[PDB]
Design a protein around this nucleic acid. Structure first.
Ligand SMILES: [Zn+2]
Length: 190
DNA sequence: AATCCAAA
Protein backbone atom coordinates (compact mmCIF):
# COMPACT_ATOMS: atom_id res chain seq x y z
CA UNK A 1 0.00 0.00 0.00
CA UNK A 2 0.98 3.63 -0.49
CA UNK A 3 1.12 4.40 3.25
CA UNK A 4 1.95 2.37 6.34
CA UNK A 5 -0.73 0.93 8.62
CA UNK A 6 -0.88 3.18 11.72
CA UNK A 7 -0.99 0.31 14.24
CA UNK A 8 2.06 -1.18 12.51
CA UNK A 9 3.92 2.13 12.81
CA UNK A 10 3.03 2.65 16.46
CA UNK A 11 4.05 -0.88 17.45
CA UNK A 12 7.27 -1.00 15.45
CA UNK A 13 8.59 2.53 16.11
CA UNK A 14 8.00 2.53 19.87
CA UNK A 15 11.35 3.47 21.36
CA UNK A 16 11.25 1.88 24.83
CA UNK A 17 14.85 0.61 24.81
CA UNK A 18 14.38 -2.88 26.28
CA UNK A 19 10.84 -3.66 25.12
CA UNK A 20 10.12 -7.16 23.82
CA UNK A 21 8.19 -8.46 20.84
CA UNK A 22 9.58 -6.47 17.88
CA UNK A 23 10.66 -9.26 15.53
CA UNK A 24 10.23 -7.32 12.28
CA UNK A 25 12.13 -4.29 10.97
CA UNK A 26 10.51 -1.37 9.15
CA UNK A 27 12.39 1.26 7.17
CA UNK A 28 11.08 4.52 5.72
CA UNK A 29 13.30 6.28 3.23
CA UNK A 30 13.53 9.64 1.50
CA UNK A 31 16.02 11.08 -0.99
CA UNK A 32 17.21 14.64 -1.62
CA UNK A 33 19.37 16.02 -4.41
CA UNK A 34 21.86 18.84 -3.94
CA UNK A 35 20.86 21.64 -6.33
CA UNK A 36 21.71 25.34 -6.10
CA UNK A 37 23.54 23.93 -3.07
CA UNK A 38 20.29 23.27 -1.22
CA UNK A 39 18.98 19.79 -0.47
CA UNK A 40 15.76 19.47 -2.50
CA UNK A 41 13.37 16.59 -1.89
CA UNK A 42 12.81 14.10 -4.73
CA UNK A 43 9.09 13.55 -4.20
CA UNK A 44 8.84 10.20 -5.99
CA UNK A 45 12.01 8.84 -4.30
CA UNK A 46 10.47 7.98 -0.94
CA UNK A 47 8.64 5.09 0.60
CA UNK A 48 8.70 2.39 3.23
CA UNK A 49 9.37 -1.33 3.42
CA UNK A 50 9.78 -4.16 5.89
CA UNK A 51 12.12 -7.11 6.16
CA UNK A 52 11.19 -10.26 4.30
CA UNK A 53 10.59 -12.62 7.20
CA UNK A 54 12.59 -15.80 7.60
CA UNK A 55 10.51 -18.83 6.48
CA UNK A 56 8.19 -16.77 4.24
CA UNK A 57 7.22 -18.72 1.12
CA UNK A 58 9.20 -17.66 -1.94
CA UNK A 59 11.93 -16.22 0.31
CA UNK A 60 12.55 -18.87 2.97
CA UNK A 61 15.91 -17.38 3.99
CA UNK A 62 14.35 -13.93 4.44
CA UNK A 63 15.97 -10.60 3.63
CA UNK A 64 16.64 -7.80 6.09
CA UNK A 65 15.00 -4.42 5.53
CA UNK A 66 18.28 -2.63 4.79
CA UNK A 67 19.08 -5.11 2.00
CA UNK A 68 15.64 -4.69 0.40
CA UNK A 69 16.27 -0.95 0.55
CA UNK A 70 19.70 -1.21 -1.08
CA UNK A 71 18.08 -3.41 -3.74
CA UNK A 72 15.69 -0.64 -4.76
CA UNK A 73 18.47 1.96 -5.31
CA UNK A 74 19.80 1.03 -8.80
CA UNK A 75 16.25 1.36 -10.16
CA UNK A 76 16.23 5.05 -9.23
CA UNK A 77 18.88 5.71 -11.91
CA UNK A 78 20.60 8.35 -9.79
CA UNK A 79 22.65 10.70 -11.95
CA UNK A 80 26.37 10.04 -11.60
CA UNK A 81 27.47 13.70 -11.35
CA UNK A 82 24.97 14.84 -8.69
CA UNK A 83 25.15 14.65 -4.90
CA UNK A 84 22.33 12.94 -3.01
CA UNK A 85 21.34 12.57 0.63
CA UNK A 86 19.44 9.39 1.48
CA UNK A 87 17.74 9.22 4.88
CA UNK A 88 16.47 5.95 6.38
CA UNK A 89 14.22 5.99 9.43
CA UNK A 90 14.63 2.47 10.82
CA UNK A 91 12.77 0.75 13.65
CA UNK A 92 15.81 -1.39 14.47
CA UNK A 93 19.33 -0.15 13.70
CA UNK A 94 21.55 -2.30 11.41
CA UNK A 95 22.85 -5.69 12.45
CA UNK A 96 26.56 -6.30 11.82
CA UNK A 97 26.13 -7.78 8.34
CA UNK A 98 23.69 -5.07 7.24
CA UNK A 99 26.07 -2.44 8.57
CA UNK A 100 28.92 -3.95 6.55
CA UNK A 101 26.79 -4.02 3.39
CA UNK A 102 25.66 -0.40 3.80
CA UNK A 103 29.29 0.60 4.41
CA UNK A 104 30.29 -1.19 1.21
CA UNK A 105 27.55 0.68 -0.67
CA UNK A 106 28.58 4.12 0.58
CA UNK A 107 32.24 3.25 -0.11
CA UNK A 108 31.39 2.45 -3.73
CA UNK A 109 28.96 5.38 -4.22
CA UNK A 110 30.68 8.50 -2.91
CA UNK A 111 28.06 10.90 -4.26
CA UNK A 112 25.53 9.47 -1.76
CA UNK A 113 25.43 10.67 1.85
CA UNK A 114 23.61 8.12 4.01
CA UNK A 115 21.79 9.14 7.21
CA UNK A 116 20.38 6.42 9.48
CA UNK A 117 17.88 7.59 12.10
CA UNK A 118 16.82 4.68 14.28
CA UNK A 119 14.04 4.18 16.82
CA UNK A 120 15.95 1.49 18.76
CA UNK A 121 19.45 0.03 18.86
CA UNK A 122 19.64 -3.56 17.61
CA UNK A 123 22.27 -5.40 19.68
CA UNK A 124 22.95 -8.34 17.31
CA UNK A 125 24.14 -10.47 20.24
CA UNK A 126 26.97 -8.05 21.00
CA UNK A 127 28.20 -7.66 17.41
CA UNK A 128 26.26 -4.61 16.26
CA UNK A 129 28.38 -2.00 18.06
CA UNK A 130 31.50 -2.69 15.99
CA UNK A 131 29.32 -2.65 12.87
CA UNK A 132 27.90 0.78 13.69
CA UNK A 133 31.43 2.08 14.26
CA UNK A 134 32.42 0.66 10.86
CA UNK A 135 29.40 2.25 9.17
CA UNK A 136 30.16 5.63 10.77
CA UNK A 137 33.82 5.39 9.72
CA UNK A 138 32.65 4.81 6.14
CA UNK A 139 30.79 8.14 6.37
CA UNK A 140 27.23 7.33 7.46
CA UNK A 141 25.54 9.72 9.87
CA UNK A 142 23.83 7.54 12.49
CA UNK A 143 21.50 9.04 15.09
CA UNK A 144 18.56 8.19 17.36
CA UNK A 145 15.07 9.23 16.22
CA UNK A 146 13.57 12.15 18.14
CA UNK A 147 9.98 13.35 18.63
CA UNK A 148 9.94 15.57 15.53
CA UNK A 149 11.26 12.69 13.42
CA UNK A 150 8.61 10.27 14.67
CA UNK A 151 6.03 12.98 13.90
CA UNK A 152 7.48 13.46 10.41
CA UNK A 153 7.21 9.73 9.73
CA UNK A 154 3.64 9.61 11.06
CA UNK A 155 2.62 12.63 9.00
CA UNK A 156 4.30 11.59 5.73
CA UNK A 157 4.55 7.76 5.68
CA UNK A 158 1.56 6.54 7.74
CA UNK A 159 -2.06 5.99 6.60
CA UNK A 160 -3.30 8.22 9.41
CA UNK A 161 -6.58 9.25 7.70
CA UNK A 162 -6.33 12.65 9.40
CA UNK A 163 -5.40 11.53 12.91
CA UNK A 164 -2.55 13.58 14.43
CA UNK A 165 0.63 12.05 15.77
CA UNK A 166 0.12 10.81 19.34
CA UNK A 167 3.42 10.39 21.20
CA UNK A 168 3.69 7.32 23.41
CA UNK A 169 4.78 7.53 27.03
CA UNK A 170 8.42 8.30 27.67
CA UNK A 171 9.28 9.00 24.02
CA UNK A 172 11.67 11.88 24.75
CA UNK A 173 13.45 10.24 27.68
CA UNK A 174 13.85 7.03 25.67
CA UNK A 175 15.31 9.00 22.76
CA UNK A 176 17.77 10.75 25.06
CA UNK A 177 18.85 7.53 26.83
CA UNK A 178 19.37 5.78 23.50
CA UNK A 179 21.31 8.81 22.26
CA UNK A 180 23.69 8.51 25.21
CA UNK A 181 24.15 4.81 24.49
CA UNK A 182 24.75 5.43 20.77
CA UNK A 183 27.29 8.12 21.63
CA UNK A 184 29.13 5.65 23.88
CA UNK A 185 29.04 3.04 21.09
CA UNK A 186 30.36 5.37 18.36
CA UNK A 187 33.25 6.56 20.55
CA UNK A 188 34.06 2.97 21.65
CA UNK A 189 33.12 3.31 25.31
CA UNK A 190 30.78 0.32 24.85
C1' DA B 1 24.95 -7.44 35.01
C1' DA B 2 21.46 -7.98 31.94
C1' DT B 3 17.69 -6.36 29.92
C1' DC B 4 16.73 -6.12 24.15
C1' DC B 5 17.36 -9.02 18.97
C1' DA B 6 11.55 -15.01 15.91
C1' DA B 7 10.56 -19.14 17.93
C1' DA B 8 7.75 -21.61 20.91
ZN1 LIG C 1 20.42 -6.84 9.22
Amino acid sequence: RHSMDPATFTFNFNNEPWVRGRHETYLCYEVERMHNDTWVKLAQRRGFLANQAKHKHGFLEGRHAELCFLDVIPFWKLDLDQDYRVTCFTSWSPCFSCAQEMAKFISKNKHVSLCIKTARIYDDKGRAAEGLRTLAEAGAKISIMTYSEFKHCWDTFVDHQGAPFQPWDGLDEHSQDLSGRLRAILQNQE
